[PDB]
């Protein structure tokens, strides 16, 4: 380092390497559909199940 040359003297370099990037590894993941339940609110995914039979039982009772 050029400031470290100003109090002591360097010899020839034995190794010349650079700055690498350390980061922690996420170690992968699995595919999932609970992840797909998330961009909508999770109560609405159960709210889909509600009015389907609201149409269905009304269609069942007026078969007359």
């Amino acid at each position: 380092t050029h400031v470290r040359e100003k109090a002591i003297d360097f010899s020839k370099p034995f190794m010349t390497l650079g700055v690498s990037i350390l980061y922690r590894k996420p170690n992968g993941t699995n595919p999932s559909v609970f992840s797909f339940l998330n961009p909508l609110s999770p109560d609405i995914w159960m709210y889909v199940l509600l009015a389907y039979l609201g149409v269905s039982v009304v269609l069942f009772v007026i078969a007359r």
Partner: peptide
Amino acid sequence: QKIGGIFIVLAAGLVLSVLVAV
């Protein structure tokens, strides 16, 4: 509730298709 949940606008046709009396 995030965007919706209104079952109130939807219930108009439920009372509409009951008409069987002449």
